[PDB]
Amino acid sequence: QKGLAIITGASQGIGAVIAAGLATDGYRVVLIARSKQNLEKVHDEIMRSNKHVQEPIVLPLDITDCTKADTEIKDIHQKYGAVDILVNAAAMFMEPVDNFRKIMEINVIAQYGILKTVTEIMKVQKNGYIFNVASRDGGIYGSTKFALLGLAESLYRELAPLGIRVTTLCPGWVNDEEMIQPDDLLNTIRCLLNLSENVCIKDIVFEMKKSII
Amino acid sequence: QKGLAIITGASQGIGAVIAAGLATDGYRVVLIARSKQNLEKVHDEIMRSNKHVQEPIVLPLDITDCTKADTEIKDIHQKYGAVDILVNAAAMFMSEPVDNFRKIMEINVIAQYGILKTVTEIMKVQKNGYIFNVASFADGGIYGSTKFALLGLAESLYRELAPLGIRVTTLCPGWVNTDMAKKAGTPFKDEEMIQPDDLLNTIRCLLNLSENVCIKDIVFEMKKSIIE
Amino acid sequence: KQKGLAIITGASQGIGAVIAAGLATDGYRVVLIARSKQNLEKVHDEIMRSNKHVQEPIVLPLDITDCTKADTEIKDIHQKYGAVDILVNAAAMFMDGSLSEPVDNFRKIMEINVIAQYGILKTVTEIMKVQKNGYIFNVASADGGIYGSTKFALLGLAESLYRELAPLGIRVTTLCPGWVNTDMAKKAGTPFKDEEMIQPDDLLNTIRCLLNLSENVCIKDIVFEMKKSIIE
Amino acid sequence: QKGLAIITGASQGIGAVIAAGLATDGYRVVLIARSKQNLEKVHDEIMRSNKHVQEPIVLPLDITDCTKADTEIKDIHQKYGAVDILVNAAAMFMEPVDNFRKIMEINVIAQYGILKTVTEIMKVQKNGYIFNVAADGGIYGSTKFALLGLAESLYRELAPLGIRVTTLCPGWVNTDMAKKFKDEEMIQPDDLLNTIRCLLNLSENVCIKDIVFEMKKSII
């Protein structure tokens, strides 16, 4: 647990909890989002709750701005070294056609841009771990949800032979503790990071007890 | 009485086969593809091969232009009546990846969404209809993302349209023996692949099932593939 | 290619009875398997009344749990009538044993549904393996896990024979319908109207469609859902 | 307080590694298998391997003998109390007809029997966790699916009762049960042990039906 940890949706909920979780674990986290108001908030807390932490890297950014987002990340790669972890924890953004195109762009294209950038870096490293946090209208939501899965699926198979691992975590509801707690997703990741170097888990599906029956 | 059967990618391969077949069965097929010229040929072949068939409607169209697609199809519906079937048989399309990824999503997913929205609007009003989807390697995940997005779309509509009386079935064949197969990178002999008629006859079987039977999808596999 | 023998289990009623009838009308010489000789004969007589010129159905009074007697009878018919083109496993699901110990009920349930099925399969597949051709069709349908386990065991069996038999020219397809409109549905007290359910003919017509696909086309399974079930 | 942790296939391989792991963690583990002496080994290793540990109960038992198994498990429950965990790590025992019948008895009928007994107990406690470790004519395939259908069935049947179930489906794991091709860089038994560790620590309302472990190698 020594290199950088890029985390989208880092200023809120799950992204924030995992950011503070890996920072405590030793990684140097890169907090991506927009609010150089909400991020710093995560920055200050992290380092105000730890005896010793590498200190978070506040990178205000709109990942939907693909070109810029790619520049920002590369720059961060030039200054602070290798990237060991990428956690896609950004919340999903749910005339008809125009809206569907817009939902695909923000939820899938942008994500693809980030993976594209971070994957080039990791392959040069022959190592790295990618974590995807999912969830679970004439098909808008479904098409978008599967688009991300199929993307994860493809990367899983082609990045494995190169030492890079991909795991998508699919929980039902998470924030009332009748749901899946954010710490559950964080601890499952710590477990993942600690498995044998040759072990690959495609994904893990988290279901709420109440939802089962 | 058999109404309209709209087929996309109707000028070549699987589409041309299913279109010619449904026309023979008695539907008035609407042939959609970019080339007016190549569509007229499928149209010609049909008239020629059938004694009594409703003349296919040649609709040169780029489904990417969802606005034009909606207008044209609704005009056809107003003029010819009920739309019984939609067969999405358009071929899968595949300087900068991110923009390339967008064009691939737009052409394969966004466009089909447009056609599906138009047609389902018509079918929802009729409280009847059958939608068939014909589906079919690294690259940073572009191919799989696109494919899964179509299935996710299909999955959602299957559930949403069921109660309205509209059925949806996605057909997933491995390599299919059409000219498009040879021009693609097919390493198998004609015989070894899934045949075009297999898909058409499966669609024929689906159309004949009782009204309340729903089959989300049928996966077609090559003996050869299983062997290997 | 002349049409040969078509063996149907659970042929005296329900879905099996309907498929057997249709296959007889299609030209196959059907072998009706079930325990009731009386009821098998009624099916035999009904088919002949529907069409007197059809190949005459072979009535085979059998308890398929008697794997040895099943093997013997089936093989004699193969010796007698030739090539076995089709096997349809449509015997109903025996789901309940009135006994004290559940572990014992689980044994009996597994014996009657999986081991028995395995037996029939073993006999017919070795016949088809010699022929290098044939088509096998399976009709699927707080237990403490007893039901679910028996159901998957059957699916697990089908899935492996699918891969195992494909290269031998033998195809396997499992049909998984929700409620089907037959007398057995009535016997099971279905809460649905007849038309609301999947009709028997849909399974029969789907089997007919599979039999006409090109020889190299393999479809492991087809799932049938009732509009209502989805609407619910 | 941590109660009993029942482990089948505890005398060797994965079950062995899982048993010693849970012992070190705090549970009083019941070691089930046929070889008494081998169960003893695990017992003593665990003993000498930890400064302090609840002493493992050695239970020489052929779970094939259902009635005896149920009895033996009830005594331990009577005598020692609550059952927190049940780890089915027993190996897959593999006229063909009668042979298939035997394979089902040993692998599925027997396991059902164990689950029945343990489930009854956890039912009352309203708490508990069950962990499953997963030209033939379809025998192996059938058996494997049978076990899965059972686990899937219980998964949603026990969830509302406060009892969780998770099936761990690994590929090749490096245990000496290596009768039969990879170079000691398969799945390590510790990976399964640690995964179970993680699952035990998740919120009590989170449910994970199964986890598929693959070899970076197997994905060519």
PDB file of N, CA and C in Angstrom, chain B residues 158-159 162-165 191-195 198-199 201-202 205 208-224 226-227, chain C residues 162-163 166-167 169 195-199 201-203 205-206 209 212-228 230-231:
ATOM      1  N   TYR B 158     -37.951  -5.859 -22.809  1.00  0.00           N
ATOM      2  CA  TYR B 158     -38.627  -7.137 -22.631  1.00  0.00           C
ATOM      3  C   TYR B 158     -39.591  -7.023 -21.451  1.00  0.00           C
ATOM      4  N   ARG B 159     -39.094  -6.494 -20.338  1.00  0.00           N
ATOM      5  CA  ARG B 159     -39.888  -6.342 -19.115  1.00  0.00           C
ATOM      6  C   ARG B 159     -40.969  -5.273 -19.235  1.00  0.00           C
ATOM      7  N   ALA B 162     -43.797  -6.191 -22.025  1.00  0.00           N
ATOM      8  CA  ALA B 162     -44.567  -7.420 -21.840  1.00  0.00           C
ATOM      9  C   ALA B 162     -46.059  -7.177 -21.595  1.00  0.00           C
ATOM     10  N   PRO B 163     -46.404  -6.444 -20.527  1.00  0.00           N
ATOM     11  CA  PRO B 163     -47.814  -6.177 -20.234  1.00  0.00           C
ATOM     12  C   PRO B 163     -48.596  -5.428 -21.314  1.00  0.00           C
ATOM     13  N   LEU B 164     -47.894  -4.658 -22.137  1.00  0.00           N
ATOM     14  CA  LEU B 164     -48.541  -3.878 -23.181  1.00  0.00           C
ATOM     15  C   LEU B 164     -48.936  -4.723 -24.385  1.00  0.00           C
ATOM     16  N   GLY B 165     -48.523  -5.985 -24.370  1.00  0.00           N
ATOM     17  CA  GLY B 165     -48.847  -6.891 -25.460  1.00  0.00           C
ATOM     18  C   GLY B 165     -47.766  -6.941 -26.525  1.00  0.00           C
ATOM     19  N   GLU B 191     -20.989 -24.311 -44.711  1.00  0.00           N
ATOM     20  CA  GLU B 191     -21.702 -25.342 -43.955  1.00  0.00           C
ATOM     21  C   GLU B 191     -21.513 -25.325 -42.439  1.00  0.00           C
ATOM     22  N   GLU B 192     -20.281 -25.096 -41.996  1.00  0.00           N
ATOM     23  CA  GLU B 192     -19.940 -25.081 -40.573  1.00  0.00           C
ATOM     24  C   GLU B 192     -20.597 -23.985 -39.740  1.00  0.00           C
ATOM     25  N   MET B 193     -21.018 -22.906 -40.388  1.00  0.00           N
ATOM     26  CA  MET B 193     -21.641 -21.806 -39.661  1.00  0.00           C
ATOM     27  C   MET B 193     -23.149 -21.950 -39.509  1.00  0.00           C
ATOM     28  N   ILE B 194     -23.718 -21.049 -38.722  1.00  0.00           N
ATOM     29  CA  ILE B 194     -25.157 -21.009 -38.532  1.00  0.00           C
ATOM     30  C   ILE B 194     -25.670 -20.467 -39.864  1.00  0.00           C
ATOM     31  N   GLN B 195     -26.759 -21.035 -40.368  1.00  0.00           N
ATOM     32  CA  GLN B 195     -27.310 -20.599 -41.647  1.00  0.00           C
ATOM     33  C   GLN B 195     -28.336 -19.471 -41.494  1.00  0.00           C
ATOM     34  N   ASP B 198     -31.862 -20.399 -40.632  1.00  0.00           N
ATOM     35  CA  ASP B 198     -32.082 -20.877 -39.278  1.00  0.00           C
ATOM     36  C   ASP B 198     -32.683 -19.745 -38.453  1.00  0.00           C
ATOM     37  N   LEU B 199     -32.188 -18.527 -38.664  1.00  0.00           N
ATOM     38  CA  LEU B 199     -32.696 -17.372 -37.924  1.00  0.00           C
ATOM     39  C   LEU B 199     -34.115 -17.028 -38.366  1.00  0.00           C
ATOM     40  N   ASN B 201     -36.376 -19.027 -39.796  1.00  0.00           N
ATOM     41  CA  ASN B 201     -37.328 -20.021 -39.356  1.00  0.00           C
ATOM     42  C   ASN B 201     -37.536 -19.932 -37.850  1.00  0.00           C
ATOM     43  N   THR B 202     -36.516 -19.539 -37.095  1.00  0.00           N
ATOM     44  CA  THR B 202     -36.711 -19.400 -35.651  1.00  0.00           C
ATOM     45  C   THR B 202     -37.690 -18.225 -35.425  1.00  0.00           C
ATOM     46  N   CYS B 205     -41.107 -19.428 -36.099  1.00  0.00           N
ATOM     47  CA  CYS B 205     -41.600 -20.213 -34.977  1.00  0.00           C
ATOM     48  C   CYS B 205     -42.052 -19.283 -33.839  1.00  0.00           C
ATOM     49  N   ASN B 208     -45.392 -17.719 -34.402  1.00  0.00           N
ATOM     50  CA  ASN B 208     -46.511 -18.656 -34.276  1.00  0.00           C
ATOM     51  C   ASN B 208     -46.848 -19.125 -32.871  1.00  0.00           C
ATOM     52  N   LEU B 209     -45.993 -18.813 -31.905  1.00  0.00           N
ATOM     53  CA  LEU B 209     -46.234 -19.210 -30.520  1.00  0.00           C
ATOM     54  C   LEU B 209     -47.494 -18.507 -30.025  1.00  0.00           C
ATOM     55  N   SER B 210     -48.166 -19.070 -29.024  1.00  0.00           N
ATOM     56  CA  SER B 210     -49.378 -18.430 -28.518  1.00  0.00           C
ATOM     57  C   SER B 210     -49.008 -17.026 -28.013  1.00  0.00           C
ATOM     58  N   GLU B 211     -49.988 -16.125 -28.011  1.00  0.00           N
ATOM     59  CA  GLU B 211     -49.788 -14.718 -27.636  1.00  0.00           C
ATOM     60  C   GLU B 211     -49.129 -14.386 -26.309  1.00  0.00           C
ATOM     61  N   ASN B 212     -49.322 -15.236 -25.315  1.00  0.00           N
ATOM     62  CA  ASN B 212     -48.772 -14.986 -23.994  1.00  0.00           C
ATOM     63  C   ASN B 212     -47.397 -15.568 -23.699  1.00  0.00           C
ATOM     64  N   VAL B 213     -46.791 -16.232 -24.682  1.00  0.00           N
ATOM     65  CA  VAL B 213     -45.480 -16.834 -24.464  1.00  0.00           C
ATOM     66  C   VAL B 213     -44.372 -15.846 -24.745  1.00  0.00           C
ATOM     67  N   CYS B 214     -43.493 -15.651 -23.775  1.00  0.00           N
ATOM     68  CA  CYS B 214     -42.380 -14.739 -23.945  1.00  0.00           C
ATOM     69  C   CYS B 214     -41.068 -15.496 -23.798  1.00  0.00           C
ATOM     70  N   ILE B 215     -40.166 -15.242 -24.735  1.00  0.00           N
ATOM     71  CA  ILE B 215     -38.840 -15.841 -24.767  1.00  0.00           C
ATOM     72  C   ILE B 215     -37.885 -14.651 -24.906  1.00  0.00           C
ATOM     73  N   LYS B 216     -37.133 -14.367 -23.858  1.00  0.00           N
ATOM     74  CA  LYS B 216     -36.235 -13.236 -23.891  1.00  0.00           C
ATOM     75  C   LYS B 216     -35.130 -13.372 -24.935  1.00  0.00           C
ATOM     76  N   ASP B 217     -34.513 -14.544 -25.031  1.00  0.00           N
ATOM     77  CA  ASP B 217     -33.457 -14.714 -26.018  1.00  0.00           C
ATOM     78  C   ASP B 217     -33.156 -16.163 -26.366  1.00  0.00           C
ATOM     79  N   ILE B 218     -32.551 -16.359 -27.531  1.00  0.00           N
ATOM     80  CA  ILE B 218     -32.161 -17.691 -27.984  1.00  0.00           C
ATOM     81  C   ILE B 218     -30.727 -17.613 -28.477  1.00  0.00           C
ATOM     82  N   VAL B 219     -29.846 -18.354 -27.814  1.00  0.00           N
ATOM     83  CA  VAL B 219     -28.438 -18.367 -28.196  1.00  0.00           C
ATOM     84  C   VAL B 219     -28.150 -19.528 -29.143  1.00  0.00           C
ATOM     85  N   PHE B 220     -27.640 -19.186 -30.322  1.00  0.00           N
ATOM     86  CA  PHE B 220     -27.304 -20.151 -31.365  1.00  0.00           C
ATOM     87  C   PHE B 220     -25.796 -20.411 -31.341  1.00  0.00           C
ATOM     88  N   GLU B 221     -25.418 -21.677 -31.271  1.00  0.00           N
ATOM     89  CA  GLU B 221     -24.018 -22.035 -31.216  1.00  0.00           C
ATOM     90  C   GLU B 221     -23.634 -23.050 -32.295  1.00  0.00           C
ATOM     91  N   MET B 222     -22.419 -22.909 -32.824  1.00  0.00           N
ATOM     92  CA  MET B 222     -21.912 -23.815 -33.853  1.00  0.00           C
ATOM     93  C   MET B 222     -21.343 -25.105 -33.257  1.00  0.00           C
ATOM     94  N   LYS B 223     -21.685 -26.233 -33.866  1.00  0.00           N
ATOM     95  CA  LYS B 223     -21.187 -27.516 -33.404  1.00  0.00           C
ATOM     96  C   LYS B 223     -19.668 -27.394 -33.359  1.00  0.00           C
ATOM     97  N   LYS B 224     -19.111 -26.877 -34.446  1.00  0.00           N
ATOM     98  CA  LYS B 224     -17.676 -26.668 -34.588  1.00  0.00           C
ATOM     99  C   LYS B 224     -17.106 -25.920 -33.386  1.00  0.00           C
ATOM    100  N   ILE B 226     -18.293 -25.654 -30.350  1.00  0.00           N
ATOM    101  CA  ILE B 226     -18.373 -26.491 -29.159  1.00  0.00           C
ATOM    102  C   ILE B 226     -17.268 -27.540 -29.189  1.00  0.00           C
ATOM    103  N   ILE B 227     -17.063 -28.148 -30.359  1.00  0.00           N
ATOM    104  CA  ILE B 227     -16.017 -29.151 -30.521  1.00  0.00           C
ATOM    105  C   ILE B 227     -14.671 -28.553 -30.132  1.00  0.00           C
TER     106      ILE B 227
ATOM    107  N   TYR C 162     -24.605 -31.830 -23.403  1.00  0.00           N
ATOM    108  CA  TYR C 162     -24.657 -30.885 -24.516  1.00  0.00           C
ATOM    109  C   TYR C 162     -23.257 -30.791 -25.127  1.00  0.00           C
ATOM    110  N   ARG C 163     -22.273 -30.518 -24.281  1.00  0.00           N
ATOM    111  CA  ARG C 163     -20.883 -30.408 -24.723  1.00  0.00           C
ATOM    112  C   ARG C 163     -20.319 -31.772 -25.112  1.00  0.00           C
ATOM    113  N   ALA C 166     -22.297 -33.076 -28.577  1.00  0.00           N
ATOM    114  CA  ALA C 166     -22.206 -32.238 -29.767  1.00  0.00           C
ATOM    115  C   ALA C 166     -21.257 -32.776 -30.840  1.00  0.00           C
ATOM    116  N   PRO C 167     -20.000 -33.067 -30.476  1.00  0.00           N
ATOM    117  CA  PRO C 167     -19.034 -33.587 -31.448  1.00  0.00           C
ATOM    118  C   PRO C 167     -19.358 -34.979 -31.998  1.00  0.00           C
ATOM    119  N   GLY C 169     -22.385 -35.708 -33.151  1.00  0.00           N
ATOM    120  CA  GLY C 169     -23.532 -35.555 -34.027  1.00  0.00           C
ATOM    121  C   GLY C 169     -24.844 -35.601 -33.266  1.00  0.00           C
ATOM    122  N   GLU C 195     -55.754 -19.961 -21.166  1.00  0.00           N
ATOM    123  CA  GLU C 195     -55.072 -19.121 -22.146  1.00  0.00           C
ATOM    124  C   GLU C 195     -53.952 -18.265 -21.575  1.00  0.00           C
ATOM    125  N   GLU C 196     -53.963 -18.047 -20.267  1.00  0.00           N
ATOM    126  CA  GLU C 196     -52.924 -17.237 -19.656  1.00  0.00           C
ATOM    127  C   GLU C 196     -51.600 -17.972 -19.623  1.00  0.00           C
ATOM    128  N   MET C 197     -51.665 -19.295 -19.593  1.00  0.00           N
ATOM    129  CA  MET C 197     -50.462 -20.104 -19.537  1.00  0.00           C
ATOM    130  C   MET C 197     -49.817 -20.373 -20.895  1.00  0.00           C
ATOM    131  N   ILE C 198     -48.644 -20.998 -20.831  1.00  0.00           N
ATOM    132  CA  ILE C 198     -47.895 -21.408 -22.009  1.00  0.00           C
ATOM    133  C   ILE C 198     -48.693 -22.606 -22.537  1.00  0.00           C
ATOM    134  N   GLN C 199     -48.923 -22.672 -23.838  1.00  0.00           N
ATOM    135  CA  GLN C 199     -49.662 -23.802 -24.379  1.00  0.00           C
ATOM    136  C   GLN C 199     -48.698 -24.943 -24.714  1.00  0.00           C
ATOM    137  N   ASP C 201     -48.653 -26.862 -27.272  1.00  0.00           N
ATOM    138  CA  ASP C 201     -48.240 -26.727 -28.657  1.00  0.00           C
ATOM    139  C   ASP C 201     -47.006 -25.855 -28.851  1.00  0.00           C
ATOM    140  N   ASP C 202     -46.811 -24.878 -27.971  1.00  0.00           N
ATOM    141  CA  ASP C 202     -45.648 -24.018 -28.088  1.00  0.00           C
ATOM    142  C   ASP C 202     -44.375 -24.844 -27.898  1.00  0.00           C
ATOM    143  N   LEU C 203     -44.389 -25.770 -26.938  1.00  0.00           N
ATOM    144  CA  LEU C 203     -43.224 -26.625 -26.711  1.00  0.00           C
ATOM    145  C   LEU C 203     -43.060 -27.551 -27.913  1.00  0.00           C
ATOM    146  N   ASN C 205     -44.250 -27.158 -31.017  1.00  0.00           N
ATOM    147  CA  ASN C 205     -43.847 -26.397 -32.192  1.00  0.00           C
ATOM    148  C   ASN C 205     -42.404 -25.927 -32.085  1.00  0.00           C
ATOM    149  N   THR C 206     -41.910 -25.666 -30.873  1.00  0.00           N
ATOM    150  CA  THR C 206     -40.520 -25.242 -30.739  1.00  0.00           C
ATOM    151  C   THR C 206     -39.607 -26.450 -31.045  1.00  0.00           C
ATOM    152  N   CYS C 209     -39.367 -26.772 -34.621  1.00  0.00           N
ATOM    153  CA  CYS C 209     -38.459 -25.783 -35.187  1.00  0.00           C
ATOM    154  C   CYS C 209     -36.988 -26.226 -35.020  1.00  0.00           C
ATOM    155  N   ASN C 212     -35.763 -28.851 -37.430  1.00  0.00           N
ATOM    156  CA  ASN C 212     -35.579 -28.393 -38.796  1.00  0.00           C
ATOM    157  C   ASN C 212     -34.418 -27.421 -38.972  1.00  0.00           C
ATOM    158  N   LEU C 213     -33.742 -27.077 -37.881  1.00  0.00           N
ATOM    159  CA  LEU C 213     -32.582 -26.187 -37.963  1.00  0.00           C
ATOM    160  C   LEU C 213     -31.475 -26.930 -38.700  1.00  0.00           C
ATOM    161  N   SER C 214     -30.456 -26.220 -39.176  1.00  0.00           N
ATOM    162  CA  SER C 214     -29.384 -26.926 -39.867  1.00  0.00           C
ATOM    163  C   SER C 214     -28.646 -27.807 -38.844  1.00  0.00           C
ATOM    164  N   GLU C 215     -28.147 -28.953 -39.294  1.00  0.00           N
ATOM    165  CA  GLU C 215     -27.477 -29.907 -38.407  1.00  0.00           C
ATOM    166  C   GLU C 215     -26.408 -29.372 -37.455  1.00  0.00           C
ATOM    167  N   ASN C 216     -25.695 -28.330 -37.850  1.00  0.00           N
ATOM    168  CA  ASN C 216     -24.654 -27.798 -36.984  1.00  0.00           C
ATOM    169  C   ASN C 216     -25.093 -26.728 -35.993  1.00  0.00           C
ATOM    170  N   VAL C 217     -26.387 -26.443 -35.963  1.00  0.00           N
ATOM    171  CA  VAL C 217     -26.909 -25.432 -35.054  1.00  0.00           C
ATOM    172  C   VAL C 217     -27.269 -26.034 -33.714  1.00  0.00           C
ATOM    173  N   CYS C 218     -26.613 -25.543 -32.671  1.00  0.00           N
ATOM    174  CA  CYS C 218     -26.854 -26.021 -31.324  1.00  0.00           C
ATOM    175  C   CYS C 218     -27.420 -24.909 -30.434  1.00  0.00           C
ATOM    176  N   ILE C 219     -28.498 -25.244 -29.732  1.00  0.00           N
ATOM    177  CA  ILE C 219     -29.177 -24.333 -28.818  1.00  0.00           C
ATOM    178  C   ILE C 219     -29.335 -25.136 -27.542  1.00  0.00           C
ATOM    179  N   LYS C 220     -28.552 -24.788 -26.532  1.00  0.00           N
ATOM    180  CA  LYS C 220     -28.580 -25.501 -25.267  1.00  0.00           C
ATOM    181  C   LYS C 220     -29.935 -25.461 -24.556  1.00  0.00           C
ATOM    182  N   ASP C 221     -30.552 -24.288 -24.499  1.00  0.00           N
ATOM    183  CA  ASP C 221     -31.828 -24.187 -23.809  1.00  0.00           C
ATOM    184  C   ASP C 221     -32.670 -22.995 -24.229  1.00  0.00           C
ATOM    185  N   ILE C 222     -33.971 -23.126 -24.021  1.00  0.00           N
ATOM    186  CA  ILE C 222     -34.914 -22.075 -24.328  1.00  0.00           C
ATOM    187  C   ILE C 222     -35.836 -21.871 -23.130  1.00  0.00           C
ATOM    188  N   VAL C 223     -35.889 -20.641 -22.628  1.00  0.00           N
ATOM    189  CA  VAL C 223     -36.736 -20.326 -21.485  1.00  0.00           C
ATOM    190  C   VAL C 223     -38.055 -19.668 -21.917  1.00  0.00           C
ATOM    191  N   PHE C 224     -39.167 -20.269 -21.490  1.00  0.00           N
ATOM    192  CA  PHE C 224     -40.514 -19.798 -21.812  1.00  0.00           C
ATOM    193  C   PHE C 224     -41.157 -19.127 -20.596  1.00  0.00           C
ATOM    194  N   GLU C 225     -41.579 -17.881 -20.751  1.00  0.00           N
ATOM    195  CA  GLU C 225     -42.232 -17.153 -19.669  1.00  0.00           C
ATOM    196  C   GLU C 225     -43.651 -16.739 -20.058  1.00  0.00           C
ATOM    197  N   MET C 226     -44.538 -16.722 -19.067  1.00  0.00           N
ATOM    198  CA  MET C 226     -45.919 -16.305 -19.261  1.00  0.00           C
ATOM    199  C   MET C 226     -45.974 -14.789 -19.138  1.00  0.00           C
ATOM    200  N   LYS C 227     -46.681 -14.133 -20.042  1.00  0.00           N
ATOM    201  CA  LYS C 227     -46.803 -12.687 -19.971  1.00  0.00           C
ATOM    202  C   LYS C 227     -47.220 -12.266 -18.557  1.00  0.00           C
ATOM    203  N   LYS C 228     -48.244 -12.924 -18.021  1.00  0.00           N
ATOM    204  CA  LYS C 228     -48.754 -12.614 -16.684  1.00  0.00           C
ATOM    205  C   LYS C 228     -47.667 -12.633 -15.609  1.00  0.00           C
ATOM    206  N   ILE C 230     -44.629 -12.090 -15.854  1.00  0.00           N
ATOM    207  CA  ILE C 230     -43.801 -10.902 -16.015  1.00  0.00           C
ATOM    208  C   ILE C 230     -44.617  -9.695 -15.560  1.00  0.00           C
ATOM    209  N   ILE C 231     -45.886  -9.668 -15.950  1.00  0.00           N
ATOM    210  CA  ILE C 231     -46.762  -8.569 -15.584  1.00  0.00           C
ATOM    211  C   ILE C 231     -46.880  -8.483 -14.076  1.00  0.00           C
TER     212      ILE C 231
END
